[PDB]
């Protein structure tokens, strides 16, 4: 499991500072947070939509991240990188 | 047809570069929203319908700073 490995290396999503994001006018708010790590060090964080996917640059690679209805993330990501999802508080 | 969320990483942006990037992005046809985002406040985030992202990036590169790269694309759900 990818969260247990992350927990072993001192990562705790409940203690991560919130992503720096805005809710844009005229589109639905994103209901998931994601946190991106290289060798278990947070590089960035953002928001995404549950039950959906997005494309993002992880290291040197363009990759699809799949987001299930519980904000759990899946996809093929480059060695040394880790991306973890959670429900945005209130959603 | 669907609005896209486009995130562009600015390489080592001054505050002035962030502001200038938001203004130019906002004036592009199809752009409905702009923001500065990311842990390092180094991302221009654009929402738009049918935006030429290659031309937004190219515009940031000639007018604001050398380093601008798409890092996220997410289609908005309705």
Residue numbers in the entry:
A (entry chain I): 23 to 113
B (entry chain A): 2 to 79
Reported in the publication:
We crystallized complexes of APikL2F with sHMA94 and APikL2A with sHMA25 following co-expression in E. coli for comparative structural analysis. X-ray diffraction data were collected at the Diamond Light Source (Oxford, UK) to 2.3 Å and 1.8 Å resolution, for APikL2F/sHMA94 and APikL2A/sHMA25, respectively. The APikL2F/sHMA94 and APikL2A/sHMA25 complexes display the three binding interfaces previously reported for AVR-Pik/HMA complexes. Consequently, we could only measure binding affinity of APikL2F to sHMA94 with a calculated Kd of 145.8 nM. However, we observed that the presence of Asn-66 in APikL2F results in an altered local hydrogen bonding network around Gln-44 in sHMA94, when compared to Asp-66 in the APikL2A/sHMA25 complex. As a result, the side chain of Gln-44 of sHMA94 is rotated relative to Gln-43 of sHMA25, allowing Gln-44 to form additional intramolecular hydrogen bonds with Thr-38 in sHMA94. In this orientation, the NE2 atom of Gln-44 interacts with the OG1 atom and backbone carbonyl of Thr-38. The altered hydrogen bonding network around Gln-44 in the APikL2F/sHMA94 complex, compared to APikL2A/sHMA25, appears to firmly lock Gln-44 in place compared to Gln-43 of sHMA25. This suggests that the interaction with Asn-66 of APikL2F results in reduced flexibility of the sHMA94 loop in interface 2. Our data indicates that this hydrogen bonding network stabilizes the interaction between APikL2F and sHMA94, providing an explanation for the binding specificity observed in the yeast two-hybrid and in vitro binding affinity assays.
Here, we unravelled the biochemical and structural basis of adaptive evolution of APikL2, an exceptionally conserved paralog of the well-studied rice-lineage specific effector AVR-Pik. Whereas AVR-Pik and other members of the six-gene AVR-Pik family show specific patterns of presence/absence polymorphisms between grass-specific lineages of M. oryzae, APikL2 stands out by being ubiquitously present in all blast fungus lineages from 13 different host species. Using biochemical, biophysical and structural biology methods, we show that a single aspartate to asparagine polymorphism expands the binding spectrum of APikL2 to host proteins of the heavy-metal associated (HMA) domain family. The structures were solved and refined as described in the Materials and Methods. In each case, the APikL2 variants and HMAs form 1:1 complexes, with both displaying the same global fold and interaction interfaces as previously described for the interaction of AVR-Pik with the Pik-1 integrated HMA domains.
